[PDB]
Design a protein around this ligand. Structure first.
Ligand SMILES: CSC[C@H](NC(=O)CC[C@H](N)C(=O)O)C(=O)NCC(=O)O
Ligand SMILES: CSC[C@H](NC(=O)CC[C@H](N)C(=O)O)C(=O)NCC(=O)O
Lengths: 217, 217
């Protein structure tokens, strides 16, 4: 079985976990636990960090026998290639590359906020900009079932994580955007995703690490 | 001709500029200028930000006729595909995806620091970590001329920007790492790269925007 190493949270493994489940991948999780405050003791990871034979040791990581992979997008692409869940044409590849990076910027905006000591002061401005961020995603998806079009690919798994987690942050945020709401349902309704989400494994919380101001538990 | 839009700085356009020059691409630059302090007035960009027909308006952008591309990695991949400067095999693609995301983490570390108000206090800790960062890049490159092996690809262009800019931040940083120094020379010695670097277009500073503590000019 493949090994997926990450913190015992949602974080950056969510899309990877879902993709692994969707693709019916044989895998098990190496789950590291961060200590509490004031420590935020990381030693579980730190001890074996340099022992896994990763070129750029990091969480998350994927071990698939010969292949040892860090960087969450690289893991996602790796698995997506293995199961034909990639953009094929130029137009699709362009769309894929734009989305992967754009979603990453959006992911990180929410993380920057929720780790910021000034969370309470900063929250409103983020919610001001929130509709415009969703609007661009909505326009882009249009009437298509999936972000690259007819066929589901890896970005849809990124898409879901970042869009859904906004909906856990601000529950009403997708209300203006019916196609994004339908996207969420489509995704969660997928036979394997649905089965997973009802299983003991599913790990939708905590969103962030114990160091977070919001979503630490 | 393609249009490359960005601020009148090095920033995230460097690798793109160099790739466009290397590939002998027909291109011209739409250069936006940020105001000074206290304003940092952005209105040059802001006015026509929503008028270029980009799905996710952003700097940098590439307009290639039908194709309008934002996100710097997306732009790089776009041009790389057009000129066969991509990882072909699985092992290459894995390496490419790892490196693109890793370098981007590294890039952002320097940017976080150089935009931080506590730049002076924070600088030493970054320089503490700096050798280990370089070491992992060095090990990964090994004896190969380019990061993916025999043939140069797009990551090399990212590689150059982030590694070189560290050498502008701390000039001695590559001294313990001869293969990285040779990488820099190999890259700078490429016929078209060399010609470009000696031309009037070449824009190696400022490193960051006027809002930066380090490398604003
Ligand atoms: C909050 S996510 C946990 C964090 N990992 C990253 O930041 C990886 C980000 C990377 N860009 C990726 O996408 O994999 C981490 O603990 N990394 C290992 C480390 O710092 O030693
Ligand atoms: C300091 S670079 C300038 C900054 N752009 C980005 O942060 C884009 C980053 C994106 N991840 C990319 O790589 O293109 C910017 O001015 N963006 C347009 C805007 O904010 O309106």
């Amino acid at each position: 079985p493949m090994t997926l190493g990450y913190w015992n949270i949602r974080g950056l493994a969510h899309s990877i976990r879902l993709l692994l489940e969707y693709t019916d991948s044989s895998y098990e999780e190496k789950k590291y636990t961060m200590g509490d405050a004031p420590d935020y003791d990381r030693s579980q990871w730190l001890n074996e960090k340099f022992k896994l034979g990763l070129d750029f040791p990091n969480l998350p990581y994927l071990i698939d026998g010969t292949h040892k992979i860090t960087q969450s997008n690289a893991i996602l692409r790796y698995i997506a290639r293995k199961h034909n869940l990639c953009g094929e044409s130029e137009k699709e590849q362009i769309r894929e590359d734009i989305l992967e990076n754009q979603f990453m910027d959006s992911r990180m905006q929410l993380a920057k906020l929720c780790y910021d000591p000034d969370f309470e002061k900063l929250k409103p401005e983020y919610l001001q900009a929130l509709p415009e961020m969703l609007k661009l995603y909505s326009q882009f998806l249009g009437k298509q079932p999936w972000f690259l079009g007819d066929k589901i690919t890896f970005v849809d798994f990124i898409a879901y994580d970042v869009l859904e987690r906004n909906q856990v942050f601000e529950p009403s945020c997708l209300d203006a955007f019916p196609n994004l709401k339908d996207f969420i349902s489509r995704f969660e309704g997928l036979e394997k995703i649905s089965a997973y989400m009802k299983s003991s494994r599913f790990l939708p919380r905590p969103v962030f690490t114990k160091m977070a101001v919001w979503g630490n538990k």
